[PDB]
């Protein structure tokens, strides 16, 4: 295990060089989401190019709440969606060539990780119960 994460500043204010509007950021957010990017991609594009540090600080609330209150909710949370599509990519690799025992092992690991947070999201009922991973 390694310690490599991001270090959120002690400040909770806009950084006083951020001369943009607190609403034009939201309009850019919903524009990028409607052209089709995941919320982590919205956050990293907004951070890199239109220099909002983080939008829970600069806007009102966090950007998945912004997308759900502006009508662009996800069908399934981003974590579960990315783990689902990684699992189905490994499954198509396994149907293609069937002597990859290591990739079978990594499929068992990815499927366990699917079930863990699918169980969490189900008891929170973000997604409905009787959800199965096909």
């Amino acid at each position: 295990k390694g310690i490599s994460s991001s270090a959120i500043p002690y400040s909770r204010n806009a950084p006083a060089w951020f001369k943009l509007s607190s609403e034009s950021v939201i309009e850019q957010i919903v524009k990028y989401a409607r052209k089709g990017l995941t919320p982590s991609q919205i956050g990293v594009l907004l951070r890199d190019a239109h220099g909002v540090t983080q939008a829970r600080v600069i806007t009102g609330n966090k950007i998945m709440r912004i997308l759900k209150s502006n009508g662009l909710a996800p069908e399934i949370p981003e974590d579960l969606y990315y783990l689902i599509k990684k699992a189905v990519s490994v499954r198509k690799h396994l149907e293609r060539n069937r002597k990859d025992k290591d990739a079978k092992f990594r499929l068992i690991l990815i499927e366990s990780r699917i079930h863990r947070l699918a169980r969490y999201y189900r008891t929170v009922a973000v997604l409905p119960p009787n959800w199965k991973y096909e």
Partner: peptide
Amino acid sequence: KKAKKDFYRFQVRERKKQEINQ
């Protein structure tokens, strides 16, 4: 720029209606 043709409520609603279209 990156992708998505999925994962959103409106996007999977539009692709389900696209299955209804054909």
